[PDB]
Structure 1
Amino acid sequence: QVQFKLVLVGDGGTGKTTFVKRHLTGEFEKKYVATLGVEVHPLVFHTNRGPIKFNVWDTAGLEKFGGLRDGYYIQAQCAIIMFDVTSRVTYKNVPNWHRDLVRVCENIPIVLCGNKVDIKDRKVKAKSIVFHRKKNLQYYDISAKSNYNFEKPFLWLARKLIGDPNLEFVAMPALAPPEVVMDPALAAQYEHDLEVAQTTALPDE
């Protein structure tokens, strides 16, 4: 198969883990559970050129920089630097993360992602985002909540790595299910869950 170790780096409370979870499960973890160390998540995409896999190393933004965490960056092939649109303090740290990345992996596709663009009180604006112009980066506004350009970073990274500018995602190679199987031993238990399922409201905003 094809694997592209991707490194997801950004200040604490920006949405890296939420971004990865929304990509691999579709849920929306609205609780802030700080990621400790690094978490490896495989995302399998299908494109017109076949299947690809991104091993997203979601790193912790609460840690400091330096060599103590260079183990994350070893043999990296693409990076996503994520900053929070509704916080300028998080945007001020993008240069530090870029420096830390390029210290270990010199030339790699790096994508800047401005998260949380669905909130009305927006501090960082499209005019003030000037860092990506000095370097050679691609800047994208994303929102893991409303699903706004939430797959553009992966598409751009795949385009730059595979080498096909006209690459785009195809639907899926989904085939019929194998067969219906049930276990009467636990069947009753399943029914109980339904008895509780109707007693809770959907997370509707």
Structure 2
Amino acid sequence: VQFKLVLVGDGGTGKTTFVKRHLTGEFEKKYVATLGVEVHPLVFHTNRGPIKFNVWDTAGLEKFGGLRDGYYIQAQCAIIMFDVTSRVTYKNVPNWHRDLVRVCENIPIVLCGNKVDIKDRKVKAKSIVFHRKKNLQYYDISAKSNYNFEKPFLWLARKLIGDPNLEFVAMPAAAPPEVVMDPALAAQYEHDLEVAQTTALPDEDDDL
């Protein structure tokens, strides 16, 4: 049970950051532009069993665009992403949508306005209506605060499985093993832990 998902939108909108958060849990603060596409499997556990997304995280910058719409072939779902702190990224939503549906004519698509965590929002709720005539689901999201960050995938899963009551569930957690500390690595740890204690945790002003 696996589905190809393409992720498109302007450079810097947070596509890769959002996927990474989902894959590993981390929040990457740096902007390293994607080169062509990055492909990563991503699994959720539902009340109907596991669902795998084959995530094609494509490049938004023209100069790094690679195969462009070539990446869209045989996609079964999509996320179009913009940045609510950048008007141009919303202005380009119809261009991404155009290029996407010319290749993928009848697929579920979520439009996502990312970075709603930032106070000075530039693309106002009132302005975001493009999704209505194109039958796209819409969510405000923040890869940084995790506002609504499950919603795009939960929605797509409900559409692809064809069950509107599908939920993400907790899978039971296996009992973890007892430990054996090698006295040969004893010192090894002292070092590695020394480095870790003296590297500051990020974002010490946040609520957690």
Q: TM-score, normalised by structure 1?
A: 0.93
Tell me if the contact between 1:66 and 1:100 (Cα under 8 Å) persists in the aligned partners.
no
Residue 3 of structure 1 is matched in structure 2 by 2
Q: Which residue does 1:81 correspond to in 2?
A: 80
String of CA shifts for 1:94-146, please: whole Å, max 9, x gaps: 00000101111101001000000011111101110010112101100000111
Gap change, CA 1:103 and 1:67, over 3 Å in 2: farther
Structure-2 change in CA distance of 1:188 and 1:65 (3 Å): closer
3-state secondary structure, aligned to 2:20: helix
Residue 200 of structure 1 deviates from its aligned partner by 2.0
Distance change (3 Å), C-alpha of 1:136 and 1:198: same
The 8 Å contact of residues 65 and 100 in structure 1, kept in 2 or not, is answered as no
CA contact (8 A) 1:48 1:168 kept: yes
Q: Classify 1:44/1:57 alpha carbon distance in 2 versus 1 (closer, same or farther; 3 Å).
A: same
**Contact persistence 1:140–1:152 (CA under 8 A):** yes
Kindly report which structure 2 residues correspond to 1:118-133, keeping only aligned pairs within 5 A, or say none. Answer: 118-133=117-132
Please identify, of 60-69 and 48-57, the stretch whose mean Cα deviation from structure 2 is larger. Answer: 60-69
Does the C-alpha gap of structure 1 residues 66 and 147 become closer, same or farther in structure 2, counting only changes over 3 Å? Answer: closer
**Structure-1 separation of matches of 2:115 and 2:3:** 26
Q: 1:10 to 1:199 in 2, by over 3 A?
A: same
Work out whether residues 42 and 56 of structure 1, in 8 Å CA contact, stay in contact via their aligned partners in 2: yes
CA gap of 1:157–1:181, structure 2 versus 1, over 3 A, is farther
Q: Which moved more, 1:68-77 or 1:35-44?
A: 68-77
Q: Which moved more, 1:47-56 or 1:64-73?
A: 64-73
1: CA distance between counterparts of 2:194 and 2:28?
Answer: 25
Once the two structures are TM-superposed, the CA of residue 204 in structure 1 deviates from its matched residue by 2.0
Contact kept, 8 Å, 1:79 with 1:111, in 2: the verdict is yes
Q: C-alpha displacement at 1:188, in angstroms?
A: 2.5
Change in CA separation of 1:173 and 1:52 when aligned onto 2, cut-off 3 Å: farther
What does the per-residue CA deviation read over 1:153-192, in whole Å, with 9 as the maximum and x for residues that have no partner? 0000000000000011111232123553555444422221
| Contact 2:58/2:65 (<8 A) preserved | no
2: distance between equivalents of 1:87 and 1:9?
Answer: 16
**After alignment, is 176-185 or 150-159 more displaced?**
176-185
Give the 3 Å change call, closer, same or farther, for CA 87–50 of structure 1 in structure 2. Answer: same
RMSD after superposition: 1.9
Pairwise CA distance, 1:198: 1.3
Deviation of 1:193 (Å): 1.0
2:34, 2:64 within 8 Å by CA — same for their partners in 1? Answer: no
- Count of equivalent residues: 204
Rounded to whole Å, the distance in 2 between the matches of 1:92 and 1:113 is 14
- TM-score, normalised to structure 2's length? 0.92
Q: Which position in structure 2 is the counterpart of 1:107?
A: 106
Deviations 1:63-113 (A, max 9, x none): 279994232111100000000000100000100000101111101001000
Structure 1 contact 70–104 (Cα < 8 Å) conserved: yes
| Seq. identity, % | 100
CA contact (8 A) 1:41 1:57 kept: yes
Structure 2 CA distance for aligned equivalents of residues 107 and 67 of structure 1: 24
Shift of 1:201: 1.7
